């Protein structure tokens, strides 16, 4: 459950948040395969509540109505077509599995669902599964409200309703079996693994019992005996009894401390600075690298009041964001996920975004296609961070340097830092308010290297900055604090 099942030499996944299946299939073929991406995290592919007040928010997809593969992203045939096409070009699909709960307990009964299935939250009836009142934790939860009230009580966090979401009785074999039926449908279609949503709200042993029912990956594409990659969304910032280490026997865990601390460092909050990153990793209190799924932002916390609050860097902070993503992609800790977002009309009032609910770009609720512009950016309000040169080229950097040790660290005691990855790559950052002009030991063979942040190696030439490495491994780097991107990265495949 710990290995991503990507092709060898592909080292990241991208979250194509709220993309339609047909667009992901095209993206696999036209971009993700040639540019070296390992795979895609898809939005929940199972039927959810259609919420009209407010209008079709992104978070309606975290309120299941059934396990039918029928959503605003597409139907089952479209989902299978995407998985097949992506696997055929060596790009994997990871499903966001929403298995702790069904929908909010106060949602009105009827057929306001993405496939038109009937459901009745008040009577606990989800006949398209089917689930009934016997399948929820109403009787087990001990709180006065029936909801989670106190995170210092690890029992209620698991047995009670997360903000009113009907909480499935995951101890029951019937419920475990319905969830496994859904997940095995997906595995047998060709999915490579799963994000387990809301894992802090599930007992480690109930997750384990579900995972014990799962198939090995589809043997038309994967070697015999391949296990699905499992990454559990456990929000653990310290200071609560539940620790993400309780989940290590099941799979990897999301390390939310990663982006929270990287954001505070790059924003220079509370006296933090990039020179402190020399011991980045477990020395900062993080989970072991081989259990970490890391990221700068995710779909919830890029809206500013998730895990990390206001420290989280996002595409709205483009210059600092590219630097944070670049640091992450260069550094060996963890398995990396890149976010790919849509734009929305962010409107802060008293420090909070009143439009944080807005769903993906749409015409009357129908998600818009992803259009590709001639400069390789996207239209229709899709941000496509994964197509930004500075991010895509760092996804490639991470592939090129895979397995190489962290070495040749330099810092100026402030915010000018650099490090290498064995003899295969080197990266230099200037986050101080002055210039960074210095000769550094790079660990690389002598030659001329293209900076892949300011440009590309194309037709045996560099389109941006060129770096000259001497016989001693040293090279001169100059980065003004006014540069478009105040970091430079070079690697073995950017050498002329
Ligand atoms: O803001 C949201 C949704 C956020 C959200 C959705 C999926 C996630 O994986 C996630 O991490 C956050 N939802 C809105 C509106 C809402 C939706 C449903 C509901 O029952 C109540 C309200 C909201 O304001 N939610 C309250 C704050 C966010 O509280 C939620 C968390 C959450 C946040 C921080 C934590 O430390 C934690 O343990 C859980 O996880 C969810 C998981 C879900 O599967 C579905 C949810 O509705 C939620 C969810 O509401
Ligand atoms: C590189 O650029 C130079 C100058 O534009 C050009 O003469 C040369 O043909 C290009 N390609 C190679 C492989 O040198
Ligand atoms: Ca639960
Ligand atoms: Cl996540």
Curated annotation (Swiss-Prot):
The modification Pyrrolidone carboxylic acid is found at residue 1. The keyword Disulfide bond applies. It catalyses: Endohydrolysis of (1->4)-alpha-D-glucosidic linkages in polysaccharides containing three or more (1->4)-alpha-linked D-glucose units. Binds 1 Ca(2+) ion per subunit. Binds 1 Cl(-) ion per subunit. It is an enzyme of class 3 (hydrolase). The active site is at 197 (nucleophile), 233 (proton donor). Detected in pancreas (at protein level). Disulfide bonds join 28-86, 70-115, 141-160, 378-384, 450-462. The record marks 300 as: Transition state stabilizer. Chloride binds at residues 195, 298, 337. Monomer. Binds to the sea anemone inhibitor helianthamide. This is Pancreatic alpha-amylase. It comes from Homo sapiens (Human). The gene is AMY2A.
């Amino acid at each position: 459950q710990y290995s991503p099942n990507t092709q060898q030499g592909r080292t990241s996944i991208v979250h194509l948040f709220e993309w339609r299946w047909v667009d992901i299939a095209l993206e696999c073929e036209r971009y993700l395969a040639p540019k070296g991406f390992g795979g895609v995290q898809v939005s929940p592919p199972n039927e959810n509540v259609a919420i009209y007040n407010p209008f079709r928010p992104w978070w309606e997809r975290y309120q299941p109505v059934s396990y039918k593969l029928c959503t605003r992203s597409g139907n089952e045939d479209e989902f299978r077509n995407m998985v097949t096409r992506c696997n055929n070009v060596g790009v994997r699909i990871y499903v966001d599995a929403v298995i702790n709960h069904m929908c909010g307990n106060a949602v009105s009964a009827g057929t306001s669902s993405t496939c038109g299935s009937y459901f009745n939250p008040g009577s606990r009836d989800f006949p398209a599964v089917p689930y009934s009142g016997w399948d929820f934790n109403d009787g087990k939860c001990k709180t006065g409200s029936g909801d989670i009230e106190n995170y210092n009580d690890a029992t209620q966090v698991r047995d009670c309703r997360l903000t009113g979401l009907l909480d499935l009785a995951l101890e029951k074999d019937y419920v475990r079996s319905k969830i496994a039926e859904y997940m095995n449908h997906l595995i047998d279609i060709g999915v490579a693994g799963f994000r387990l949503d809301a894992s802090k709200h599930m007992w480690p042993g109930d997750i384990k019992a579900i995972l014990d029912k799962l198939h090995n990956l589809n043997s038309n594409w994967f070697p015999a005996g391949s296990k699905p990659f499992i990454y559990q969304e456990v929000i653990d910032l310290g200071g609560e009894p539940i620790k993400s280490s309780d989940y290590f026997g099941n799979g990897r865990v999301t390390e939310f401390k990663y982006g929270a601390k990287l954001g505070t460092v790059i924003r220079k909050w509370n006296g933090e600075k990039m020179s402190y990153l020399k011991n980045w990793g477990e020395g900062w209190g993080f989970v072991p690298s081989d259990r970490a799924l890391v990221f700068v932002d995710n779909h919830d916390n890029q809206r500013g009041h998730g895990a990390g609050g206001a420290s989280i860097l996002t595409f709205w902070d483009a210059r600092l964001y590219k630097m944070a993503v670049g640091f992450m992609l260069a550094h060996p800790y963890g398995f990396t996920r890149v976010m790919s977002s849509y734009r929305w009309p962010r409107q802060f009032q008293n420090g909070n975004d009143v439009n944080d609910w807005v769903g993906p770009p749409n015409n009357n609720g129908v998600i818009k296609e992803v259009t590709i512009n001639p400069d390789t950016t996207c239209g229709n309000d899709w941000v496509c961070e994964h197509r930004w040169r500075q991010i895509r080229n760092m996804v490639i950097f991470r592939n090129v340097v895979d397995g190489q040790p962290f070495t040749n660290w330099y810092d100026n005691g402030s915010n000018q830092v650099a490090f290498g990855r064995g003899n295969r790559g080197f990266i230099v950052f200037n986050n101080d308010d002055w210039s960074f002009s210095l000769t550094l030991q790079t660990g690389l063979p002598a030659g001329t290297y293209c900076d892949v942040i300011s440009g590309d190696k194309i037709n045996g030439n560099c389109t941006g900055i060129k770096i000259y490495v001497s016989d001693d491994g040293k090279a001169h780097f100059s980065i003004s604090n006014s540069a478009e991107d105040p970091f430079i990265a070079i690697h073995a495949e950017s050498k002329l």
